[PDB]
Amino acid sequence: HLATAEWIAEPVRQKIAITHKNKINRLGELILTSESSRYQFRNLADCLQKIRDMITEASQTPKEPTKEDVKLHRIRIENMNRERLRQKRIHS
Amino acid sequence: DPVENEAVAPEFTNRNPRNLELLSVARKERGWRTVFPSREFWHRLRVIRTQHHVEALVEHQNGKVVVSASTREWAIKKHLYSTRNVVACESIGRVLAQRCLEAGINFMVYQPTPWEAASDSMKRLQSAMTEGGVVLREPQRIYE
Amino acid sequence: YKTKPTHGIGKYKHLIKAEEP
Amino acid sequence: QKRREREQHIAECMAKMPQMIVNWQQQQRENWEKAQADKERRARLQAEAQELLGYQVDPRSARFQELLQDLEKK
Amino acid sequence: LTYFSARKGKRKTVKAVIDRFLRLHCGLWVRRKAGYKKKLWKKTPARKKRLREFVFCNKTQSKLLDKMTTSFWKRRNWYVDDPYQKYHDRTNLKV
Amino acid sequence: RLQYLIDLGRVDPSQPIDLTQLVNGRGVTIQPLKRDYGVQLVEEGADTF
Amino acid sequence: RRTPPLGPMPNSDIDLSNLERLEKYRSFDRYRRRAEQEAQAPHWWRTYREYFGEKTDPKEKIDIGLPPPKVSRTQQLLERKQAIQELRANVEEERAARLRTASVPLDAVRAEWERTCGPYHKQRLAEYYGLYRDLFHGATFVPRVPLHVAYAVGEDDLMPVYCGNEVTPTEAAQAPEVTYEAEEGSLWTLLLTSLDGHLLEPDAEYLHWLLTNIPGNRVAEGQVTCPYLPPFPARGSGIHRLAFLLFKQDQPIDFSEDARPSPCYQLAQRTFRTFDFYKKHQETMTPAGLSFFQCRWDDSVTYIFHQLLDMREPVFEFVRPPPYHPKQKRFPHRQPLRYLDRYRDSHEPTYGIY
Amino acid sequence: QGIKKMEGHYVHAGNIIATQRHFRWHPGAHVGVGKNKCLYALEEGIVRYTKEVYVPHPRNTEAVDLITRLPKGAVLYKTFVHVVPAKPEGTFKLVAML
Amino acid sequence: KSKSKNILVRMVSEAGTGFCFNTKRNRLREKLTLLHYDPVVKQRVLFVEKKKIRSL
RNA sequence: CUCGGAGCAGAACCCAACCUCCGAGCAGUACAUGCUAAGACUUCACCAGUCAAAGCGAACUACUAUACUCAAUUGAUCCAAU
RNA sequence: ACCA
């Protein structure tokens, strides 16, 4: 449960809840899964390393401009042309 | 006590004819590399220029016209001195670009001939499409 | 294919004028 | 040490490359301009012939090229 | 081939084969391609890449290379960090 | 294989286990003349050990 | 052996006796235009169209819409010609067009377009998006009543719905502002259906909104047969069509047996079939208006699933077929060493009996 | 050289459909051409051969010079080979209920 | 054999990576300087001709 | 005496002759003619030869491009030079 | 210079 978690700094718990919304279930649990090994040791080690990474990433707060992915370009254009059809109120 | 609202089929059927295309995962018709024009697109801009009129179309590779703008429309003709000069080509561009955004079409290919590509009338029609938001290159298909 | 009713559909050299120096 | 020594050499040589490239392109562009100039230079000499073809076509061009060089050297 | 040595009465290995081919424990033999270091300046990158592959031999060659080598060369080895270790056993192979 | 040897009583975990105990329990066969340098403990079976 | 052609062969109508006399396609564009006309004709040989073109039904698509308006072409053509003469009479317009500095007012073009070609452009666009295919099983209608729908975003902005543009579920959190031109005393019905959002049945829809017996254009006064529920496109399930349908009523109709409770948060009750709904009420109802947008998942859809619908948020993935490999051979002759990796299941070293 | 996959045959992506020295068969839908004029399948599915109108690329000078000299009304045809894709690109499957 | 127009020459990276590649040039032409992709530094850099490998 | 094209050998492929003909033992453009990898072709074996999606890097807005034009334009292993 |  990310909220109840106390070993994670409160600010980080807030930031994580945002950048990993899609890993939080209805009850508020952060769920991590690894299936890249036939050994449970090495799958759990990957699960814990993800938790250990989410925290490090949140606390760093990198502001570096990352290279734009291909799938993002399509959204940016699609997003740009949706605020172009946005009208205004007749009587402001 | 099964919740009825959570009765979800294992596979989702999306019948939107644009879903796979809007996801960039649909097949474009590759091939036809000894003939002109290519079919490797989802939508294309086709400009038909006649002796008296200018018509620009956006059609799917399947041949269905999605949106269209011609000087034969009274809505456009009533504001044009001439329906066959550069201004009409530039006007058809500005009109169709708006009808494209209102139809969700943001990307298409334009397949001009070498002379058509260099003409000022077409050079003005494309910049009217660019200014209107429509991008005249399509995103690449995602295979993986 | 020669045995097919569509044989020769790609014939075109008869439509051009013979220009053979 | 060997590793460091090589990495330093590459970073060293790679610090000069941006200037090396533009300098090289400038010399490519300069030579390219002389290719067109040479083409125009040759074309003029033939036009002076005024289609006076025949046997005295090969030596005619050579002597005029040398004559222009003499003025250029001076 | 030497089917019976004069000293030991044993069959001998043809050492030409050992210097050119790799035997995987499953019975496959791996070779380099002939001419992969010859006249690279006249070969296309597609051809050059084909020439750099490690490839398998056919059954006839495998049977031949098995006969030219003794049993020592077919034993399972457990070399540390063998680059080919995972290629020694077959997976999901039917008939 | 190590777990199996212990479960069948062929290797005694109450005492130190080295090469002599694995050979004597017939758990591994070592061939120094074939350039064996000993046993490598490999992970297969780690979940149930 | 020869088989005679099954019909006219190409280029047979060309008289090659007088070859030098015949005119030629001196141009590329001239040839191309004739070629594309030829590609469109029906042929007795096998064509790309046979194998790739959609197989439309032979019977014509039944029209179920309002009758076309009555217009006098004579009076229109006269007035239409008069107007152009006045434009061309002006010397300033000729100069801007000659100097390539003229422009058209897009607002006026749009305004007039709504009343002339709009309806027929909206029909082809709704046909490309497959709405008549799904909503009415192929029956078509021209939306001759311009329908304006806008979702209020913030306080000063509106988000129109048009025909196919994308509106987010957040923008469409709350019911849209709807307006249209209707005479006093007329009765209308407005529904919003998600064509693609259904989570259980592939052939069914969700009824997001239903307003019946609206008096004229006074939408607020219409009976709230089904309350408004924002679009909930599931995550990773792609883009969904959301279609507004404006129906013209011949008389006041009683929809008491099809009304949903307020609030309606049961997906089993919102299951809807527009073709079944209309077929039942076709005798006193006619499609008149059509607008629709596309909607994909956003964060606000989680709130709908968790709070309003009281369920878990379903997540989907686009799964591709597994790659093809030929049957593994005992001796893969000349294949590269990595041929074995194509038939391996695990990357971690195995050890067999040891 | 010649056809490797006749009408109706099932191909996997990459399958060489036909080899040729000159263009007897032209690439159609989902059929790529290699630099030796090799026709190969770009998708998985069924091989079709059809007769289509031939429109060259305007930059192909020799072919364009041909069509410009054709009598008005004369249309060139070539034999094309296609692959009708057998499977969809993918499916949407339920991966979670969170 | 006697006839010879082109020669094979080695082009060494000016990036100091030690990367080399071979190209043909006209024998009478001047020594080649080229902009070529160097995999070690993973970018296009200058290469200078150093040695004639052989005559073609 | 090796390699390509045409006929013989008319239409999937293959097909001999101290058979009939004509050619090749290169030039030219590049300098990503970089890497990598599904699936395939194949000169009746083998060796050798061939084509290629996707991917990574690049390039990039109107025939070109992750596989230049071109028909052949060619030589295994050992060994030698580095 | 010219081993294979």
CATH of the domain at H79: 2.40.50.100
Position of tokens 């060489």?
Answer: H16
Give the separation between CA G167 and CA A81, rounded to whole angstroms: 11
D22 in I contact zone (CB under 8 Å): no
Q: How distant is C1' of J2 from CA of I56, in Å? A: 20
Q: Hey, how many other C-beta atoms are within 10 angstroms of the C-beta on C19? A: 6
- Is the backbone peptide bond immediately before G68 cis, with ω within 30 degrees of 0? no
**CA-based angle B138:B142:B143, to the nearest 5?**
140
Give the separation between CA B58 and CA B69, rounded to whole angstroms: 9
| Count of the separate structural domains present in chain I | 1
Query: Cβ distance B140 to B24 under 8 Å?
Result: yes
Residue G211 pairs in a beta bridge with G190, G224
Residue I31 pairs in a beta bridge with none
Position of tokens 């998985």?
Answer: H44
With a CB cutoff of 8 Å and minimum separation 6, the contacts of F13 are F6
Sheet with strand E55-56: strands edge to edge: E21-23, E29-31, E55-56
With a CB cutoff of 8 Å and minimum separation 6, the contacts of B75 are G108, G109, G110, G111, G112, G113, G116, G117
Identify which of A84, A65, A59 has the alpha carbon closest to the alpha carbon of residue A8: A59
Is there a contact between B82 and G97 if contact means CB atoms under 8 Å apart?
A: yes
| Count of the separate structural domains present in chain H | 1
Method of determination? Answer: cryo-EM
If DSSP states are collapsed to H, E and C, what string results for G114-180? HHCCHHHHHHHHHHHCCHHHHHCCCCECCCCCCEEEEEEECCCEEEECCEEEECCCCCCCCCCEEEE
With a CB cutoff of 8 Å and minimum separation 6, the contacts of E86 are G340, G344, G349
CATH of the domain at G160: 3.90.280.10
Q: Hey, how many other C-beta atoms are within 10 angstroms of the C-beta on G328? A: 16
Is there a contact between C4 and G3 if contact means CB atoms under 8 Å apart?
A: yes
Is there a contact between C8 and G9 if contact means CB atoms under 8 Å apart?
A: yes
Q: Which chain G residue shows the shortest CA-CA distance from A87?
A: G158
Query: Cβ distance I30 to D4 under 8 Å?
Result: no
Give the separation between CA B55 and CA B29, rounded to whole angstroms: 25
Position of tokens 């370009």?
Answer: A73
Which residue ranges form the domains of chain B, and what is each CATH number? 3-143 (3.30.420.80)
- For residue G203, what are the domain limits? 122-308
- CA of G323 vs chain E CAs: smallest distance (Å): 16
G15-18 own/partner pairs: CB under 8 Å, 24+ apart: G16/C14, G16/C15
Give the separation between CA I9 and CA I54, rounded to whole angstroms: 7
Answer whether any strand J atom is within 7 A of the Cβ of E57: yes
E34 is written with which tokens? 């002939």
The topology under which CATH files domain A1-60 is Double Stranded RNA Binding Domain (3.30.160)
- For residue H65, what are the domain limits? 1-98
Sheet with strand H2-3: strands edge to edge: H2-3, H16-19, H39-41, H31-33
Which nucleotides in chain J lie less than 7 Å from some protein C-beta? 5-6, 11-14, 26-42, 45-55, 57-58, 61-64, 67-70, 74-77
Question: Please, how many CA atoms are within 13 Å of residue B143, restricted to the half-sphere of its CB?
Answer: 6
- CA of F14 vs chain G CAs: smallest distance (Å): 23
- DSSP secondary structure code for residue G221 in this structure: G
Q: Which residue is nearest to nucleotide J77 (CA to C1')?
A: E34
Q: Which residues of C touch G19 (CB under 8 A)?
A: 15, 17
Collapsed DSSP state (helix, strand, coil) of residue G229: coil
Residue type present at position B128: A
Q: Hey, how many other C-beta atoms are within 10 angstroms of the C-beta on G8? A: 10
Give the separation between CA G333 and CA E61, rounded to whole angstroms: 10
Burial class (CB in 10 A: 0-12, 13-18, 19+), G143: buried
- For residue I55, what are the domain limits? 5-56
Identify which of B97, B87, B84 has the alpha carbon closest to the alpha carbon of residue B55: B84
Residues in chain H: 98
Chains touching chain G at 3 or more Cβ pairs under 8 angstroms? A, B, C, E, F, H
CATH of the domain at I40: 2.20.28.120
Q: Is A63 left (phi over 0), alpha (psi -120 to 50) or beta?
A: alpha
Collapsed DSSP state (helix, strand, coil) of residue G332: coil
Q: How distant is C1' of J66 from CA of H75, in Å? A: 37
Report CA dihedral (G208, G212, G217, G219) to the nearest 10 degrees: -50
Question: How distant, in Å, are the alpha carbons of A17, A49, G259, G318, H97 from that of A33?
Answer: 17, 11, 44, 19, 14
With a CB cutoff of 8 Å and minimum separation 6, the contacts of G96 are B81, B87, G102
Residue B69 pairs in a beta bridge with B56
Give the separation between CA G304 and CA B103, rounded to whole angstroms: 27
In window 25-84 of H, residues with CB < 7 A from nucleic chain J are 32, 34-36, 38, 40, 42, 56-57, 59-60
Answer whether any strand J atom is within 7 A of the Cβ of B102: no
B52 in G contact zone (CB under 8 Å): no
Answer whether any strand J atom is within 7 A of the Cβ of I18: no
Q: Which residues of H touch G46 (CB under 8 A)?
A: 48-51
Q: Is E35 left (phi over 0), alpha (psi -120 to 50) or beta?
A: left
